Ligand binder design. Structure first.
Ligand SMILES: O=C(O)Cc1c[nH]c2ccccc12
Length: 308
């Protein structure tokens, strides 16, 4: 009987926390009680910025990081912060895990990765309506990592910060909106702060569930096969729950808070995609400078997408 503390950073109602709870439930079940998990949601054990170095301290056995909160640190897996044309968190979460399983980039060698998943595709949630690219101009919008560099290519003024700091940045007028997936309209009640939603069909935010290496090595081989055996299912499950939850979330926001939804013209969309193309090369260049094979990574992205 061994018990693992699992640090998380956002409120318990948000999807990073819902997936942690479902994960914990499967570990208890599949190990027939041999493993238990005590979860600390809402940043009570570790928060968003001390998540990684704190899992590695051993201050918590397991944690959940958003790759985009750590610029430079993940030269390979940050490809998953580019617009890879995904339209569901299910598909993207699955392809992300396979791409990680099959390559094991050294950026992530100092911890043990238990599973990976993403957000749904990003859209604009703003306090004033955005009906064109022109409206985006100069408007401070929250992103992180490469989703900020995307905001920037589109002409908005990106402000990088983790999700928990976002409600307060909006309220105090430091940002005018946020660029991410629509589950937060409910799970963080952005429906009471940003009454407008514009379709972007943009890049996802990728997450990794990590574990302290020494903690992982103190697990027997049998318990280890249980956690490795849970990884791919759980990635898909997390992606599938979120695609459903995004619908409910937006249903609630419209009929209980009168959210207004807008779309951009096709010529604005065309042009925004042309605007972000240079990020693929800059991503390819930082990976190479770090000793990675971006050509290989993109070849593996392509091939995985033609399955999932
Ligand atoms: O925007 C992000 O930081 C990624 C993201 C999307 N939905 C979230 C819910 C809780 C915490 C992080 C996220």
């Amino acid at each position: 009987p061994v018990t693992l503390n699992y640090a998380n950073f956002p409120p318990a109602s948000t999807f990073p926390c819902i997936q942690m709870e479902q994960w914990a439930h499967e570990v208890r079940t599949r190990t027939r009680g041999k493993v238990d998990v005590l979860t600390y949601p809402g940043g009570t054990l570790l928060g968003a910025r001390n998540m990684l170095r704190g899992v590695m301290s051993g201050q918590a056995d397991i944690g959940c990081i958003s790759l985009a909160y750590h610029p430079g640190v993940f030269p390979v897996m940050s490809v998953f912060e580019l617009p890879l044309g995904f339209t569901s968190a299910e598909a993207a979460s699955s392809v992300l895990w396979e791409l990680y399983s099959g390559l094991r980039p050294a950026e992530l060698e100092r911890v043990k990765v238990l599973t990976m998943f993403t957000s749904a595709p990003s859209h604009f949630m703003t306090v004033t309506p955005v009906r064109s690219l022109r409206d985006l101009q100069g408007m401070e919008i929250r992103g992180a990592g490469t989703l900020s560099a995307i905001l920037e290519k589109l002409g908005a003024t990106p402000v990088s910060m983790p999700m928990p700091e976002v409600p307060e940045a909006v309220q105090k007028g430091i940002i005018k909106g946020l660029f991410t997936s629509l589950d937060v309209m409910k799970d963080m009640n952005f429906a009471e702060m940003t009454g407008h939603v514009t379709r972007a069909d943009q890049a996802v935010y990728p997450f990794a569930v990590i574990m302290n290496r020494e903690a992982w090595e103190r697990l027997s081989p049998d318990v280890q096969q249980v956690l490795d055996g849970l990884a791919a299912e759980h990635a898909a499950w997390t992606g599938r729950y979120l695609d459903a939850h995004v619908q409910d979330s937006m249903r609630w926001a419209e009929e209980k808070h009168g959210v207004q939804v807008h779309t951009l013209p096709e010529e604005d969309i065309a042009a925004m995609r042309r605007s972000v193309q240079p990020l693929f090369d800059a991503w390819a260049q930082r990976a190479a400078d770090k000793g990675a094979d971006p050509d290989a990574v993109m070849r593996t992205v392509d091939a995985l997408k033609a399955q999932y």
